[PDB]
Design a binder for these strands. Structure first.
Lengths: 227, 226
DNA sequence: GTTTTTAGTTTATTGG
DNA sequence: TAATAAACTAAAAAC
């Protein structure tokens, strides 16, 4: 129950205050690592193999390994090349219809809950996005790194909010140069009908209530078992 | 290019041999941890706080820590209490229209292509999913873990390849507990009607070609210093 | 064997 | 004080 980001939407000169929230959280049980012999929590020490001594974090540096195994100590100015990391405002690039986006790149989502002082300007954007059904492709800065993200509105009955989903880059989808589907397809139309009623008998409507994390609940029962 | 697992979609009687591929492979640059005094790589080795002696992994146990900080001695039989890990087939539950699912739950995507020489069984389902235009929800199993996923098709011009996306559980979405947004705001229609074309001034169409990871390319340019 | 892929696990900022 | 990204181990299936 705590926000993550506190900035504004920098589309032109609009600057609506927004309180980004973590839309989803990993309810999956995260365990801990302990030593059964002596009941001791485990800690990792980073010790060089060749010499064998402990060091503080501040004396090491990032190193990119190429095919030949070269090591490069990245200079501070090279990392500081981006002026967008200095930026702390969501920059808006364009607006695209919601049906013109592909559902594969939607990686992680966050809420956009505004500040009540100027909520009138926020509700205008929300109602406009509900009207034109236009998704917004926005540059997103977070955790000192920049991710391409989308901005769109999802009704929740009582109140409408806009939601931000971080997409992968367009170069982050492998092109499937598959040769097996270039084979000529020979299907008699008599067979095509059978697949119809087979799926149609399995008809249903999306019911999120019925679905459960089957393993996680049975493992959670273990937690209550011991204590 | 190497596959991940080789099973087969198995609901009722249909059993189409399939070869799952990784749809997205993060090409973001990954770095090792290195310091100059050794001029070499770094290793993580595990020690006990109280003992102070290096211990092997094989004599350590899973532990869950509640608010009280109590231990949990995880055994093998209780971990094996769920036999879905033994399954190596994609189990299908139902089919749902593509418009009845919302795009938030998609987490990671995987491709689906046949393995056997006969591809008729694949193409039947592929053409079926492009006619009824309905998704399919599976009880996907992968890497001794079970995750809910869904089947749907992305026509790539020449092939009707269908893909699988792993969705989060319905309890994995936090409720929108904002009691401030329900406030009634009176908007003059003039503001909305002049904001209409204001938004439309920035209208465009999706052009993935011109979008790039600027930071990744600048950093890569730094790597090519050699 | 093989290097990829993937899930499990401290850990080190940073921002409410 | 809690969430997100670095970076490594540690299985662990395909062929």
């Amino acid at each position: 129950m705590r926000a993550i980001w506190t900035g504004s939407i920098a589309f032109g000169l609009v600057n609506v205050p927004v309180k980004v929230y973590s839309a989803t959280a990993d309810h999956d049980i995260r365990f801990h690592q302990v030593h059964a012999k002596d009941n001791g929590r485990i800690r990792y020490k980073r010790v060089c193999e060749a010499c064998g001594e402990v060091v503080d974090y501040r004396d090491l540096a990032r190193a990119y390994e190429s095919g030949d195994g070269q090591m490069v100590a990245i200079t501070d100015d090279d990392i500081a090349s981006l002026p967008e990391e200095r930026s702390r405002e969501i920059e808006v690039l364009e607006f695209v219809p919601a049906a013109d986006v592909d559902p594969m790149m939607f990686d992680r989502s966050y809420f956009l809950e505004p500040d009540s002082k100027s909520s009138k300007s926020y509700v205008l954007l929300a109602k406009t996005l509900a009207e034109t059904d236009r998704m917004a492709i926005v540059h997103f800065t977070l955790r000192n790194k920049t991710r391409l993200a989308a901005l769109r509105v999802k009704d929740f009955g009582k109140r409408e909010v806009m939601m931000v989903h971080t997409l992968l880059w367009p170069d982050e989808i492998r092109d499937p140069d598959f040769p097996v589907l270039d084979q000529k397809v020979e299907i008699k139309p008599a067979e095509l009908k059978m697949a119809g009623q087979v799926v149609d008998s399995m008809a249903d409507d999306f019911n999120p209530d019925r679905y459960h994390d089957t393993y996680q609940e049975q493992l959670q029962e273990l937690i209550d078992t011991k204590l």
